[PDB]
Amino acid sequence: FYSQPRLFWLSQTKVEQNHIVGGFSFELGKVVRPWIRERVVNQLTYIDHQLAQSVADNLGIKLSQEQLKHPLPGPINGLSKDRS
Amino acid sequence: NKAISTVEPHYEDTAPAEPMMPGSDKTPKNRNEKLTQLDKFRFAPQGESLRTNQGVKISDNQNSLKSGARGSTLLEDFILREKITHFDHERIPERVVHARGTGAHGYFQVYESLASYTTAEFLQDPSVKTPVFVRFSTVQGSRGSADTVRDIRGWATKFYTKEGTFDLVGNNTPVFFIQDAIKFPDFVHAVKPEPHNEIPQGQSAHDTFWDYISLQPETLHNVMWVMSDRGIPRSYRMMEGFGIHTYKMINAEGQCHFIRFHWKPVYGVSSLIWDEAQLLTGCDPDFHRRELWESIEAGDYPEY
Amino acid sequence: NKAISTVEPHYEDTAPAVEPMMPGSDKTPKNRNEKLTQLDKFRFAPQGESLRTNQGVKISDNQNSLKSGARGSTLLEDFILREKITHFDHERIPERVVHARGTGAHGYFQVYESLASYTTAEFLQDPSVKTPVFVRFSTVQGSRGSADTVRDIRGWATKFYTKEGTFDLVGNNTPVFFIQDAIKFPDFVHAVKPEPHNEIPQGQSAHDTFWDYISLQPETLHNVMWVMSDRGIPRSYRMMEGFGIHTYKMINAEGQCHFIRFHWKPVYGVSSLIWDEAQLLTGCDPDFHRRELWESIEAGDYPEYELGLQIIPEEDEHKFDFDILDPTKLIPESLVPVHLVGKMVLNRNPDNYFSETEQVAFCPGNIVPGIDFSDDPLLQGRLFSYIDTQISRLGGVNFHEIPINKPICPFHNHQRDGMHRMSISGTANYEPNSINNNWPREAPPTEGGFTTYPQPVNGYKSRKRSSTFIDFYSQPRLFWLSQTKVEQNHIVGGFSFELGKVVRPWIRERVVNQLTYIDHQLAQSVADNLGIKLSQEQLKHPLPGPINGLSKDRSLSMYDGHHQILKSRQVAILAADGVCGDAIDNIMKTLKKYGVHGKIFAPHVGRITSLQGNEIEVNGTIEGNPSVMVDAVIIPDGEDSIDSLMKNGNAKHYVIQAFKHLKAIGLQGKAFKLYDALPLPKPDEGIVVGDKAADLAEAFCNVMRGHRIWSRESVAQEIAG
Amino acid sequence: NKAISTVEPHYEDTAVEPMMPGSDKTPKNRNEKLTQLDKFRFAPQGESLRTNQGVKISDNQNSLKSGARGSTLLEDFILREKITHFDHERIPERVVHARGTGAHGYFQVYESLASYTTAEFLQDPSVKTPVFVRFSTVQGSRGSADTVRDIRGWATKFYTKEGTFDLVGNNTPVFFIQDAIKFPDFVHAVKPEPHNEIPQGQSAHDTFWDYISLQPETLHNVMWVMSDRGIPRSYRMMEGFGIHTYKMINAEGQCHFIRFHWKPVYGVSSLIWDEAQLLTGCDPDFHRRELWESIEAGDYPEYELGLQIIPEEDEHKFDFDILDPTKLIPESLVPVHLVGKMVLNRNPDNYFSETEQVAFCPGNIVPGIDFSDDPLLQGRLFSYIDTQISRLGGVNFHEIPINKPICPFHNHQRDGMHRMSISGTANYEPNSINNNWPREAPPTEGGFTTYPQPVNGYKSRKRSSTFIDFYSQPRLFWLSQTKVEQNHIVGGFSFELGKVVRPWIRERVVNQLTYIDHQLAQSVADNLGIKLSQEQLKHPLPGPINGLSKDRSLSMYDGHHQILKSRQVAILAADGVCGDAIDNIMKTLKKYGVHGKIFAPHVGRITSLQGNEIEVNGTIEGNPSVMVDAVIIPDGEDSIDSLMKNGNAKHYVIQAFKHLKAIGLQGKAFKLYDALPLPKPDEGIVVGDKAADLAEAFCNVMRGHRIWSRESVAQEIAG
Amino acid sequence: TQISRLGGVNFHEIPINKPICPFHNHQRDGMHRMSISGTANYEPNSINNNWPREAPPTEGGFTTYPQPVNGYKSRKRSSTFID
Numbered sequence A: 001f002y003s004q005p006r007l008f009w010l011s012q013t014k015v016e017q018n019h020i021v022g023g024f025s026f027e028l029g030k031v032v033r034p035w036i037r038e039r040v041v042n043q044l045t046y047i048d049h050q051l052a053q054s055v056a057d058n059l060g061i062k063l064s065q066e067q068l069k070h071p072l073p074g075p076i077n078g079l080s081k082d083r084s
Numbered sequence B: 001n002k003a004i005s006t007v008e009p010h011y012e013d014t015a016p017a018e019p020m021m022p023g024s025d026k027t028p029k030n031r032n033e034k035l036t037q038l039d040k041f042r043f044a045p046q047g048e049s050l051r052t053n054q055g056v057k058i059s060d061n062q063n064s065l066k067s068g069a070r071g072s073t074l075l076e077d078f079i080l081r082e083k084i085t086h087f088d089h090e091r092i093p094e095r096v097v098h099a100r101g102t103g104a105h106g107y108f109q110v111y112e113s114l115a116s117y118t119t120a121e122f123l124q125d126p127s128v129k130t131p132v133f134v135r136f137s138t139v140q141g142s143r144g145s146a147d148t149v150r151d152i153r154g155w156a157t158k159f160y161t162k163e164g165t166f167d168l169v170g171n172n173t174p175v176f177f178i179q180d181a182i183k184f185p186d187f188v189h190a191v192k193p194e195p196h197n198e199i200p201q202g203q204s205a206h207d208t209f210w211d212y213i214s215l216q217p218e219t220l221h222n223v224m225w226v227m228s229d230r231g232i233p234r235s236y237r238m239m240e241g242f243g244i245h246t247y248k249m250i251n252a253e254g255q256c257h258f259i260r261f262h263w264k265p266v267y268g269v270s271s272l273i274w275d276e277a278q279l280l281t282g283c284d285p286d287f288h289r290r291e292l293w294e295s296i297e298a299g300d301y302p303e304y
Numbered sequence C: 001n002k003a004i005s006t007v008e009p010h011y012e013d014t015a016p017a018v019e020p021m022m023p024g025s026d027k028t029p030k031n032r033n034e035k036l037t038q039l040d041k042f043r044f045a046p047q048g049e050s051l052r053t054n055q056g057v058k059i060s061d062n063q064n065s066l067k068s069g070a071r072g073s074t075l076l077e078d079f080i081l082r083e084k085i086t087h088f089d090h091e092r093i094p095e096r097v098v099h100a101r102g103t104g105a106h107g108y109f110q111v112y113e114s115l116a117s118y119t120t121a122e123f124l125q126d127p128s129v130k131t132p133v134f135v136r137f138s139t140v141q142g143s144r145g146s147a148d149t150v151r152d153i154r155g156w157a158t159k160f161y162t163k164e165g166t167f168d169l170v171g172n173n174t175p176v177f178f179i180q181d182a183i184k185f186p187d188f189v190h191a192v193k194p195e196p197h198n199e200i201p202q203g204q205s206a207h208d209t210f211w212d213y214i215s216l217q218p219e220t221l222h223n224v225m226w227v228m229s230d231r232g233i234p235r236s237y238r239m240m241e242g243f244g245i246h247t248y249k250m251i252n253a254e255g256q257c258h259f260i261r262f263h264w265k266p267v268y269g270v271s272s273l274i275w276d277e278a279q280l281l282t283g284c285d286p287d288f289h290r291r292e293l294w295e296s297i298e299a300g301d302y303p304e305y306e307l308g309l310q311i312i313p314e315e316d317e318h319k320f321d322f323d324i325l326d327p328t329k330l331i332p333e334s335l336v337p338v339h340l341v342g343k344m345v346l347n348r349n350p351d352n353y354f355s356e357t358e359q360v361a362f363c364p365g366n367i368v369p370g371i372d373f374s375d376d377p378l379l380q381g382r383l384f385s386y387i388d389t390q391i392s393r394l395g396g397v398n399f400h401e402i403p404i405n406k407p408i409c410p411f412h413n414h415q416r417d418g419m420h421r422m423s424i425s426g427t428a429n430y431e432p433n434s435i436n437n438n439w440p441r442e443a444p445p446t447e448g449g450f451t452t453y454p455q456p457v458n459g460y461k462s463r464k465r466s467s468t469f470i471d472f473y474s475q476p477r478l479f480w481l482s483q484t485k486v487e488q489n490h491i492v493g494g495f496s497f498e499l500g501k502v503v504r505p506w507i508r509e510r511v512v513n514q515l516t517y518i519d520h521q522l523a524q525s526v527a528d529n530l531g532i533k534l535s536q537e538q539l540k541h542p543l544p545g546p547i548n549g550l551s552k553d554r555s556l557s558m559y560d561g562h563h564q565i566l567k568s569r570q571v572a573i574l575a576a577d578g579v580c581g582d583a584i585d586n587i588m589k590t591l592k593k594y595g596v597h598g599k600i601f602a603p604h605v606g607r608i609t610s611l612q613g614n615e616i617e618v619n620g621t622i623e624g625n626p627s628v629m630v631d632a633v634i635i636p637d638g639e640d641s642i643d644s645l646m647k648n649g650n651a652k653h654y655v656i657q658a659f660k661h662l663k664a665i666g667l668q669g670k671a672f673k674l675y676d677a678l679p680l681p682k683p684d685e686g687i688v689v690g691d692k693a694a695d696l697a698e699a700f701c702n703v704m705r706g707h708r709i710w711s712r713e714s715v716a717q718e719i720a721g
Numbered sequence D: 001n002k003a004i005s006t007v008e009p010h011y012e013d014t015a016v017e018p019m020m021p022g023s024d025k026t027p028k029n030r031n032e033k034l035t036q037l038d039k040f041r042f043a044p045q046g047e048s049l050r051t052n053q054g055v056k057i058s059d060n061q062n063s064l065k066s067g068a069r070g071s072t073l074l075e076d077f078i079l080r081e082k083i084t085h086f087d088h089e090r091i092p093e094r095v096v097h098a099r100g101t102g103a104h105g106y107f108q109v110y111e112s113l114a115s116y117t118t119a120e121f122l123q124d125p126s127v128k129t130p131v132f133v134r135f136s137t138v139q140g141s142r143g144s145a146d147t148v149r150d151i152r153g154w155a156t157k158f159y160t161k162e163g164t165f166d167l168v169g170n171n172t173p174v175f176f177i178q179d180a181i182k183f184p185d186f187v188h189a190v191k192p193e194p195h196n197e198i199p200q201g202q203s204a205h206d207t208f209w210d211y212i213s214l215q216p217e218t219l220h221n222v223m224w225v226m227s228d229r230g231i232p233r234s235y236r237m238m239e240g241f242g243i244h245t246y247k248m249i250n251a252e253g254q255c256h257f258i259r260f261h262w263k264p265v266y267g268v269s270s271l272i273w274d275e276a277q278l279l280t281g282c283d284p285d286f287h288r289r290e291l292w293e294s295i296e297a298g299d300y301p302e303y304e305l306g307l308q309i310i311p312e313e314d315e316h317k318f319d320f321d322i323l324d325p326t327k328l329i330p331e332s333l334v335p336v337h338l339v340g341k342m343v344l345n346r347n348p349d350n351y352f353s354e355t356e357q358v359a360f361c362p363g364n365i366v367p368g369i370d371f372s373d374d375p376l377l378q379g380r381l382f383s384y385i386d387t388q389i390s391r392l393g394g395v396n397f398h399e400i401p402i403n404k405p406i407c408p409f410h411n412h413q414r415d416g417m418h419r420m421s422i423s424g425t426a427n428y429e430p431n432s433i434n435n436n437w438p439r440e441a442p443p444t445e446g447g448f449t450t451y452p453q454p455v456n457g458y459k460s461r462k463r464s465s466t467f468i469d470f471y472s473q474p475r476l477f478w479l480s481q482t483k484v485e486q487n488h489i490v491g492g493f494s495f496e497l498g499k500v501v502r503p504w505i506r507e508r509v510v511n512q513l514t515y516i517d518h519q520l521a522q523s524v525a526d527n528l529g530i531k532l533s534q535e536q537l538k539h540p541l542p543g544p545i546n547g548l549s550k551d552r553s554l555s556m557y558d559g560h561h562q563i564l565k566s567r568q569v570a571i572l573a574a575d576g577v578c579g580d581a582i583d584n585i586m587k588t589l590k591k592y593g594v595h596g597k598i599f600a601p602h603v604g605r606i607t608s609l610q611g612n613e614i615e616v617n618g619t620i621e622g623n624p625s626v627m628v629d630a631v632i633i634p635d636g637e638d639s640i641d642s643l644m645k646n647g648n649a650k651h652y653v654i655q656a657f658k659h660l661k662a663i664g665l666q667g668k669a670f671k672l673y674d675a676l677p678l679p680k681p682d683e684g685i686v687v688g689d690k691a692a693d694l695a696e697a698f699c700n701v702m703r704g705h706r707i708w709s710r711e712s713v714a715q716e717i718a719g
Numbered sequence E: 001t002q003i004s005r006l007g008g009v010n011f012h013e014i015p016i017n018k019p020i021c022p023f024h025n026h027q028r029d030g031m032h033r034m035s036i037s038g039t040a041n042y043e044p045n046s047i048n049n050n051w052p053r054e055a056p057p058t059e060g061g062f063t064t065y066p067q068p069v070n071g072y073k074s075r076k077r078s079s080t081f082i083d
């Protein structure tokens, strides 16, 4: 579930990454039940650690050291990013 | 006077002796075989009398039939009742997803025979002008919801081939949210307006959608796509398209290749930014629909 | 393996071991009536229940299709899949042909004292009775996903579930309608709706075909005036007026007939947005009105309205300078007063929007004994439409058996069958019969059987507009002369903005020409905004005289003839980390003392920390909740909080936008530095600065009583924002 | 004045037994489903006539007009609501089996079947599982006649605690086709031809026999419908079959192959063709009425559920594919274990609300039962739910009261036309906002699972080679028939083909017959004036099926019981009949559970020679002999004389004779028979002077159902 | 009745029901709309010069014969019917 989201994340320009952080934060900021926001941020820690941290900051969510050490997926057929 | 006349039957001209217009009015030279088939269902009302659906000429389209001019409307006014009955039943159900959409006519040509991979007729001869109809759409909103929302965009192409109608029903991202079709009602229900209050319109920014996402991590890839600026395209002319699924192509030898379908826009891939897209839903909820229609009327024909 | 467990059957708990909006049974179960109790039998309690097929078979695996192997082809024999997908595939029903966009609520109605002198209608006889109601508010033009705060007429449909039958009062929020005869309705609607080639525009009369129809049908000008006014952009379904529009008859027990017209008068006052605010609000909350109504009931700010009647004896029918059967004519309240005869409260949201709000069916034909129709030629045509449209919208002639539409009194008859027949009849299906002793039986008039008042009918069969109807300009003038100067400017703004989107110039010219028969200043001001030079003759155009002694009527002006209510309003509290916690606590308490809802908007959600190390829950981001969503803005003190906000363009824009929208702005202490940095002028009567938060909040609240700072309108035009 | 009142509002009272709604006539016969239906019932006694909105109506005699002689006004909402509902009463008829009848009852298992299946309704003999049953023909539309020649549908809805299970079968053990894709082709062939919509309720036309002639797979079921099985005497007196092989799965996970059977307690009995066709004329509601009246009489339909049980390892041990729906499993090879009993004991209250709106589908299985790979059945699974979408107006047809389960049915489905349920919890799974209720149920807690059958093959459109056997089972069925049953088969083919206009279709069908049995073909060919080639006469005939050439159970009269109870006897009587004869006949009839109906030249009461008055059941003219199983004529000089002046009453005797029925003649009644152009009395003409004696002898003759030996001389009778 | 029997308000477009004369008007949409309209869908209009147009009675536009109407709104069987 996470290798292709990570591949997408790392193929983005910095600007594009910032707008992805904005999407999650704006959308999750309209979610009333806090455990849903915290669970979504938890899923983001399996994709990229900075993405999770940037989004959790915008939601007032303190990431745990366990979360910040969540394993990330490896390359896909030796590929870490794709320009397209 | 001529105030009295406005409420009496109108037998005189009303026009005094460029706005968007139907395609037959603005681009009658843009023809294909499909459009020609449609010609016989078109109307030419110039000079024609207003009539009932049974062909009966109407003398007075301003007043119900009554017991005197200040009287009670009579059940025997078949004209009123026909006119009102038709109006009362104009609406049909909107599509359960992609309710909000806009369509246009065109044509497709293959570059060179793909006989080595497929026997499909419309991919054999570059000289054939295969008529298409395309419907672009959002996904979540109902049919009055705004164009420039953050959402997946649907992209459905109907190829009218000599060997059958082939539909390529894709989106503007290369993956989807779920893996098995048994989850689709659950996923759609989660993203749609919530069942108690039917809020929010045209937005995944609500609890039930992210509840589903959090419990179904297979969704994360396409979620990444729609949270990016791919979810707010600048124009239907400026996004990519994807069949998403692997299909098969079978050539005349019976050899199968696995295939995936792409649409690459000749006008590039460009998007709004979120704040501009949100403001556009307020001042032109019809922006993409307007833009496509006007781009065709200007000669900036969508090419993919 | 936990990733694997998500795609396998879920047999374990999923929940963790501001409150969100919820079904009315969850939030307000104590608010009851007889209709809601009748609906209880259709409710479900799934707690502890297995997921099942519609036939009642338990499902073991809601995650996977049945396939030829784990990685194979889907089998046709998977009946669970196909049942689930089939139901989904056929969820949608046709939307209403007009008023597609709407929102509903439950409540009750009570009559103040018996109206038995005027009507035998059961629901107006006994003050002790609580009559259940269901109400659907709506726009007119937009499809079912269109935005709330558009410029449109609002529809207002009340279903009274009386013991003598279901009574539908199907009205709008303006006292007149656009056309005089039902036969024109599809023409007018087609003209206002999106245009047929491209289906543009959504939720807007600002396009060619609408104004084309207007310029050729001057009967429309009166109701056009209303919707071009701020009446067309209401702040809340709780803060608008309601009207049945048509003249009805009321019949008492002696057979005497009184002509009447229905009114709803809001207890929370009459308040509107301003156009630029309303537009932006369609952008950032298309569900604003719907959400606001839902939350107001959950907060206990229950919509309250007084039912009013204008009562005209039968002999006074021809005593007016207009036809009371003309639905483009209102009856001035200075001529015929509105008698407040009862009150309605909406106090319970639905549990399921589709089962209740989408499927409800109202029709003007649904009257009760004691009320009768007039010869209003629009009303007469309306009686046919509502039952007819419902045949396709709700799937056939048994839509009255849908739970929300069911009466709460009996309803035996000889009708049978039809699609979705739910009742099971076992007696003779024809009258008269002897095999069941002719039950059910006709009821004599003296026992409550419906009878039409024997009005005389004299004339010749004809299609002709009554000459008493040929007056298209006197009441649009009366409306204009009744408006304050600010209100007239917004009228001019409405006409100008809408005409400016009209592509064909001659349509714009012909509409302005119509305006020259209503008022010359109105016409000229609209012409200027459109680059149209009016002719000398056009400025010479004859204007209509007064109406039964009246040049104007204070009741026609919203801001000069109706109250503004502070309770239930919304206020944005702009704060960041480092805010003074005492100020927030004192501001919030003061606002709630007056029924005003304070919402903290911060640069992030969750909690902000005060300058005292305390954590304050935030209602949302400033980004997510722009100023058009609140009635007023207050910024409390805190050195770190004001500095953070001065580095935030959204924050700064909030105050600029609130200023331009003529709203109250409160600034505590160092927060005035934030206002000083903005290119806004010296603080006006709608800018309040102080340092003690409680005293500041009190003065703020007092400013909010005025609704909007109208005097600021001129300087706000120039402000960049 | 009173004439005037009939067109004014009716405010006053206006008021052997007639057919009535089930609630009126059998309220004491109850079950869980009928109790659930009670909420939807209405009692208008003492209630006002009202609109659909609950407004009382004062004048149900007149439209609202401009004056008593004026124009009707559009504002008359009462009239327009009333007409509007009437205008939209009709919903689409079923595409097949449009003509049908329903009744409520219950089912009881004899002993737990836990060894073979986990299905809840087959676990506990103390449970009474409610059922609703619809019987039907196949070809005809809604108004077509009951006693046509056709397959009969037999759909049972079992309302179980673990779900609604539908057993949708027919009254024969095979079907006409092997693969669902051919269903629209077969139905179009049998249905009325598309240009002229002729003929109604008959397979006797060109397009049907055209299809038969080009699709030999159809011959087996054709043999059944050309037999007397195609014209059952009564829905109470036919067998029933699910046809397809289903699976049964027990708690260990063991799979048995299963075939369902219904065996009638009242025996298996049929009409004869001449009689059946006459009956579509004189009572097109005969089977519906008979079932309704049998329930009201107490002659409740009863059927035993049977199963043929085949262990999974035995699937390939037959000379036919058990997955082939044109094959039956002979009861000589695999016997039918009677596992339960079904009793029909309550008529509906409203035909439309219950019988018309009921929805059955073979895909409505429950845990413990599963599907097989029978390619007909697999296609049926898609079709039943899909068809209901238009027939019953949307996807909420399960909320229509007759279609509701009696167990819970929580899920995340929402909306759709005419949604009755009001949901207030999360409409998606998985959710946390409602802790994921409703929840999936583990297989050990009753969650449905598919048995993990192996799947090996290539994706292809191909008929399995094990399906390609078209004539062996038709030959087995032919060889198992008695000789009277063989002749009626021949008469069926000959009458039907006689109405085919194109002669080559007739010759092509006869050619098919030569691959079944040569004398069958020869007999039909002779009837149609067709000369059979000698090549045709020696066409090769199929061999025995697992060493079997006949199967007694395939014959109705040789293989099954005939029951005397519930049959109907016409008693022809006029004024002047001997009253003591009638009493003695009735008392005897009743002793055996037979129903005596007095048919007389006029309705009301007839006077006996003793001067007592006797209540008449109907006129002779109105109730012809085809409506009864036998005829008895009591003595009485004036009665007999009146009957001999009556052409119908004389014809009554001639016709009953031709139809091989038992006729009893008392005393001077024999005069009437003797005056007729009829041969001398045979075993079926009971003559006596003592009424009681005569009746006992007459009842014993009835036990044989028909006097088959009379059939040859019956064809020379002018009646 | 024909709204449900024939599937909606365009049953006049089913071939057997179509008239053989012209039949232009401002009606639109409805289930199974066959014809494709491209002109103004309201009357009066100026953007297509109010075509299709009402027809004067002396040009064959339907008119109701002006029979006198005199009575009281009532549900009553005419005395002249009681035979």
Ligand code: HEM
Pocket: B095, B096, B097, B098, B101, B135, B136, B137, B153, B154, B155, B156, B169, B170, B171, B176, B181, B184, B243, B244, B245, C085, C089
């Ligand atoms: C692979 C992911 C999918 C894509 C890219 C996709 C694409 C689309 C598009 C573009 C449309 C709109 C077509 C139009 O303009 O009329 C559409 C409609 C629809 N889709 Fe999907 N879809 C997907 C998955 C699903 C699934 C899993 C289901 C459920 C089984 C589903 C059911 C529907 C339905 C019911 C409609 C409405 C069709 C109609 O009313 O005409 N789709 N899909």
Ligand code: HEM
Pocket: B084, B088, C095, C096, C097, C098, C099, C102, C136, C137, C138, C155, C156, C157, C170, C171, C172, C177, C182, C185, C244, C245, C246, C327, C360, C361, C362, C378, C381, C382, C385, C386, C389, C390, C393
């Ligand atoms: C007096 C002017 C009128 C007012 C105030 C009015 C008001 C309304 C309202 C409030 C609704 C929406 C009710 C709801 O579902 O919540 C509505 C629906 C409707 N009206 Fe009107 N209307 C007027 C005139 C007309 C006319 C002249 C016609 C045409 C004959 C018409 C036909 C309809 C129809 C067909 C609907 C949709 C009903 C449904 O789908 O259930 N109305 N009207």
Ligand code: HEM
Pocket: D094, D095, D096, D097, D100, D134, D135, D136, D152, D153, D154, D155, D168, D169, D170, D174, D175, D180, D183, D242, D243, D244, D325, D358, D359, D360, D376, D379, D380, D383, D384, D387, D388, D391
């Ligand atoms: C073994 C062969 C079959 C048998 C025994 C059988 C039996 C029946 C019966 C008894 C009914 C009437 C149910 C009722 O009373 O409501 C029926 C209806 C029907 N069957 Fe079949 N059928 C068979 C094959 C097929 C096939 C192959 C199809 C098509 C795929 C089909 C489609 C239908 C349809 C559409 C209905 C109407 C259902 C409804 O409207 O409720 N059946 N079947």
